[PDB]
Amino acid sequence: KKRVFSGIQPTGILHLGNYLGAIESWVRLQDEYDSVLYSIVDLHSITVPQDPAVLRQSILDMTAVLLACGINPEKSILFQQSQVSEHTQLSWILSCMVRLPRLQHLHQWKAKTTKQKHDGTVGLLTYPVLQAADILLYKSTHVPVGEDQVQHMELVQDLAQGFNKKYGEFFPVPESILTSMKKVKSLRDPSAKMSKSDPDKLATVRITDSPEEIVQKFRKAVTDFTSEVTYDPAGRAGVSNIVAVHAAVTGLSVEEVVRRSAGMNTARYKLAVADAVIEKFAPIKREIEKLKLDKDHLEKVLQIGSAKAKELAYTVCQEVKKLVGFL
Amino acid sequence: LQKDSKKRVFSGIQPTGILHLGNYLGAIESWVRLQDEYDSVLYSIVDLHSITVPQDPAVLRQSILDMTAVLLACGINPEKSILFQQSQVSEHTQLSWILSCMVRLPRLQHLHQWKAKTTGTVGLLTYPVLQAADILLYKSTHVPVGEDQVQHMELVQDLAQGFNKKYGEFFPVPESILTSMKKVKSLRDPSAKMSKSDPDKLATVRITDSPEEIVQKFRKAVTDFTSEVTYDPAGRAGVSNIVAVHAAVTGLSVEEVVRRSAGMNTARYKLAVADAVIEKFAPIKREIEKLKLDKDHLEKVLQIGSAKAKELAYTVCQEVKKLVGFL
Ligand SMILES: Nc1ncnc2c1ncn2[C@@H]1O[C@H](COP(=O)(O)OP(=O)(O)OP(=O)(O)O)[C@@H](O)[C@H]1O
Ligand SMILES: Nc1ncnc2c1ncn2[C@@H]1O[C@H](COP(=O)(O)OP(=O)(O)OP(=O)(O)O)[C@@H](O)[C@H]1O
Ligand SMILES: CNC1=NC(=O)[C@H]([C@H](C)c2c[nH]c3ccccc23)O1
Ligand SMILES: CNC1=NC(=O)[C@H]([C@H](C)c2c[nH]c3ccccc23)O1
Ligand SMILES: [Mn+2]
Ligand SMILES: [Mn+2]
Ligand SMILES: [Mn+2]
Ligand SMILES: [Mn+2]
């Protein structure tokens, strides 16, 4: 059977990259596939230190945001990763199949400075394995992610294959789902992806930002000194990112938005894109504001989702234990 | 040093391999005794730990049953202690993940066990973290182990303290219990500990060994060619190990066995120790043989024990989750 799985960390506020890279896919997917699971991955969150009150609130906030984006709990299973014990159990098993250098040499770790590598947690080092577990546990076939997680998907595939080699065919080898906006760039540093953890508030366009805030971020967005608007990602990273965003939020092609902007300079154009983003977000923000007020419902939503996931997970984990030799 | 009110003993053994003199003198004998000295005692067959070395599932399966027989035979009493299967309690890996988010890679890399085995998997690298979780999960205060695990125990204490520093005093900082026989030496290499994983059958005195086998192993035991029997670990490692075993099995002191052996050559002396070991093991071996006959009973003992552990564990893990911010 086919099944979609994807995850998002509760920490920070959901932004334009998350939305274009993945969340939009999630919403579409729920109507295309019979079985769909979306997880707020709180376990992944703590790979970096979290304040407990902040984390608790982020989970609630993310729940509101996802619902506001269109995730329907009648159609998908929206759940809290920590509430399903099986994730870590499978992760352990998987970790017994992975050599340390495989993890060390993943770009997301490898890129770090020697110091940063000395400072990061073992959880941070190992999250791809947990990620593999999150996916494999439900025998998922399709996984929507951003570009930064592609390498991890290969590991997930290798893990499925490796388990299968040993114990016989058990796990489907999952496939990534990527969008054109797989790597939305930071507004302030177009070399970098847009991130929830970016300390620079200007860089990141959040779902909950005011129109005034969004316009300002686009006003401050780094471009270049060419007046005309063109799409040229190698040449003009910031402008191209902005154009791409525009195309994505409008449903027009890059070629069309560039066409429509003739005679408009970048500076003006950037504010246009901001207006487009504001429109796309606006209904979502209205719903979030409504949802934020009923904590109980948000908690209930996760609880029920978590119960549904647990039923699925328990069954698989028992099968896994038998294959391994535990039972 | 241990000044928490509720005392609890925790210890674990890997199902894989054949229990040997070092396991028995180092740990297992202790366990039996402890079950009478402490009101709460947990002994875990740590199957999760075994798979840090790839296992054949049939072999692992059988190993678990066999370890259960061996422990019962040694005198572990399931109405006095909780004898359980690690894998049946999901909380261990849950806690382990959280702890792994509080430790850095170099700390793990520098551990002697890791360095020794890898001169290697993520699971192997991180077993000490799981070990900490195994202990901490039950708010255990006392941990009987051999010498080879002492370094790991210092990490367990550090992890408890780390968690406590962050979230408030929650975990007791456990203490090792060590015997005189904390490092029983290999009969063929007195510089090395006796190990289940040692390929050289002669080095290892197994619980299931025959009297002829045991006598031969002592006969072949490596030692010096000084005729008299003395205790001198620095200068006479092999002989001293044999003397120490003799004293442990008999209940007599090292100083006493040496005096009684006055007028005895080393060769005859070694065989005398062998006889003493055979006698100690003989009832245990008979019971093992009997217990192996009823697999349903062995399975049921673990099942019952695992259910008891699960209830204890669930309660703690929920508390931990609240502290962390998951709940
Ligand atoms: N700039 C981006 N463009 C497209 N997709 C993205 C972008 N940033 C994150 N994603 C995707 O969003 C999903 C959730 O990732 P995550 O929760 O780590 O968000 P994040 O913005 O990277 O936050 P953090 O900075 O805390 O890691 C993943 O599939 C990830 O690939
Ligand atoms: N030679 C020894 N002397 C005393 N205690 C030992 C000895 N070897 C192991 N132990 C103890 O026995 C317990 C179980 O360890 P374990 O199950 O790993 O046995 P092992 O013989 O080391 O097997 P392996 O070689 O597969 O690791 C631990 O507390 C360990 O410290
Ligand atoms: C720091 N952990 C992490 N970052 C990521 O981008 C992934 C995401 C959040 C993730 C965790 N489990 C998943 C399962 C399927 C798709 C994405 C994820 O994990
Ligand atoms: C390979 N894993 C491992 N080797 C050891 O000696 C320890 C033992 C078996 C262990 C696992 N969990 C424990 C909790 C308390 C005391 C010992 C252990 O772990
Ligand atoms: Mn991320
Ligand atoms: Mn419009
Ligand atoms: Mn060992
Ligand atoms: Mn006797």
CA distance A60 to A68: 12
Angle formed by the axes of helices A122-136 and B91-100, to 10°?
A: 140
Are A42 and A79 in contact, with CB atoms under 8 Å apart?
no
The size of chain B, in residues, is 327
| Pair of tokens at residue A251 | 């449903």
Annotated binding site: which residue ranges of A? 9, 15-18, 134, 146-148, 184, 193-197
Candidates B48, B94, B125; nearest CB to A85:
B94
Atom 30 of ligand 1 has which residue's CA nearest to it? A146
Between the CA of residue B199 and those of A319, B60, B116, B202, B323, what are the distances in Å? 33, 18, 16, 9, 46
Q: What is the DSSP string of B44-100?
A: EE-HHHHTTS---HHHHHHHHHHHHHHHHHHT--TTTSEEEEGGG-THHHHHHHHHH
Tokens of A289: 């504001």
Contact B104, A119 (CB under 8 A): yes
Q: CB B122 to CB A99 under 8 A? A: yes
B165 is catalytic: no
* H/E run at residue A248: helix A237-250
**Resolution, expressed in angstroms to one decimal:** 1.8
Tell me which chain B residues have a C-beta less than 8 angstroms from the C-beta of A51.
325
Tokens of B41: 């005692």
CATH code of B1-183+295-327, in short, is: 3.40.50.620
Helix axis angle for A122-136 and A150-167, nearest 10°, is: 60
What kind of fold does domain B184-294 have according to CATH? Answer: Tyrosyl-Transfer RNA Synthetase (1.10.240)
Query: Distance between CA atoms of A323 and B2, rounded to whole angstroms?
Result: 41
AA identity, residue A324: V
State how far Cα B9 lies from the chain centre: 13
CB contact set of B130 (below 8 Å; sequence gap of 6+): A92, B48, B49, B92, B93, B96
Round to whole Å and give the CA distance between B100 and B162.
Answer: 12
Instruction: Report which protein residue has its CA nearest ligand 3's atom 15.
Output: A6
Beta bridge partners of B185: B193
Q: Which alpha helices (H) appear in B90-201, and where do they start and end?
A: 91-100, 105-109, 112-117, 122-125, 127-136, 150-167
Nearest to A245 by CA among A268, A216, A271, A225: A271
Q: Which of B145, B195, B138, B184 is nearest to B31 (CA)?
A: B145
Partners of A121 in the β-ladder: B104
- Are B144 and B177 within 8 A, CB to CB? yes
Query: Is any atom of ligand 3 closer than 6 Å to the C-beta of A22?
Result: no
**Secondary structure of residue A193 in the 3-state scheme:** strand
Q: Which amino acid is at A111?
A: A
Query: Between the CA atoms of B27, B31, B34 and B40, what dihedral angle is there, to the nearest 10 degrees?
Result: 120
User: What is the residue whose two structure tokens read 């796990």?
Assistant: A171
Q: Note whether A21 and A147 are within 8 A (CB).
A: yes
Number of CB atoms found within 10 A of residue A194's CB = 27
Query: What token pair was written down for B295?
Result: 């697999």
Which two tokens mark A54? 């902040």
Which residue has tokens 């053994």?
B13
Residue with tokens 């090292």: B254
Cβ-based neighbour number of residue B22 at 10 Å: 26
B217-to-B187, B201, B211 alpha-carbon distances in Å: 7, 9, 10
**Identity of the amino acid at B92:** H
Amino acid of residue B169: E
Tell me the two tokens of residue A16.
């334009």
Of the candidates A174, A142, A143, the residue with the CA atom closest to the CA atom of residue A160: A174
Decide if B1-183+295-327 and B184-294 have a common fold.
no
Distance CA B121, CA A108 (A): 19
Q: Could you give the dihedral angle defined by the CA atoms of residues A320, A137, A51 and A124, in that order, rounded to the nearest 10 degrees?
A: 80
Rounded to an integer, what distance in angstroms lies between the CA atom of residue B250 and that of residue B247?
5
Q: Is A193 a catalytic residue?
A: yes
Among the options B7, B80, B117, B310, which is catalytic?
B117
Backbone break loci in chain A, preceding residues, C–N > 2.5 A: none
**Cα–Cα distance measured from residue A218 to residue A237, given in angstroms and rounded to the nearest whole number:** 14
Place of tokens 């290499």: B189
Domain ranges of chain A: 1-183+295-327, 184-294
Which residues in chain B are followed by a discontinuity, with C-to-N distance exceeding 2.5 angstroms?
Answer: 119
Contacts 24+ apart (CB under 8 A), B262-268: B262/B229, B264/B229, B265/B227, B265/B229, B266/B223, B266/B224, B266/B225, B266/B226, B266/B227, B266/B228, B266/B229, B266/B239, B267/B219
Q: Are A174 and A140 in contact (CB under 8 A)?
A: yes
Round to whole Å and give the CA distance between B310 and B319. Answer: 14
Q: Which of A2, A75, A112, A117 is catalytic?
A: A112
- Experimental approach: X-ray
Distance CA B186, CA B22 (A): 9
Is B34 annotated to bind a ligand? Reply is no
**Distance, C-alpha A305 to centroid of its chain:** 19
- Residue B95 makes CB contacts below 8 A (sequence gap 6+) with B133, B136, B137, B317, B320
Neighbouring residues of A257: CB distance < 8 A, sequence distance ≥ 6: A243, A246, A247, A250
C-beta separation of B280 from B214 below 8 A = no
| A152 Cα: distance to centroid of ligand 3 (angstroms) | 9
B59-69 burial code (b ≥16 CB/10 A, e <16) = ebbebbbbbbb
What 3-state class would DSSP assign to A94?
A: helix
- With CB atoms and an 8 Å threshold, state whether A121 touches B130: no
* Joined tokens for residue B150: 């002492």
Place of tokens 């092609």: A253
Characterize the bridge pairing of strands A36-40 and A77-80: parallel
DSSP, residue by residue, B197-240? T-S-GGG--BTT--HHHHHHHHHH------SS----TTT-HHHH
Amino acid at A6: S
Chain A residues in contact with B326 (beta carbon < 8 A): 42, 55-56, 59, 80, 82-83
CB-CB neighbors (< 8 A) of A123 in chain B: 97, 100-102
Residue in B287, B279, B143, B291 with CA at minimum distance from that of residue B211? B279
C-alpha span between A16 and A61 (Å, rounded): 16
Find the catalytic residue in A117, A196, A308, A310. Answer: A196
Cβ-contact B152, B135 below 8 angstroms: no
Buried b (16+ CB within 10 A) or exposed e, B85-105: bbbbbbbbbbbbbbbbbbbeb
Rounded to whole angstroms, how far apart are CA atoms B270 and B153? 34
Is B134 within any annotated ligand binding site?
yes
Q: Are A40 and A62 in contact (CB under 8 A)?
A: yes
Beta bridge partner(s), residue A175: A142
Locus of tokens 């191209």 = A240
Residue partners of A259: CB distance under 8 A and separation at least 6? none
CA distance linking residue A183 with residue A18, whole number of Å:
9
For chain B, give percent helix, strand, coil, nearest 5: 55, 10, 35
Q: Can you tell me which residue has the tokens 């509080």?
A: B102
CB burial of residue B189 (10 Å; 0-12, 13-18, 19+): middle
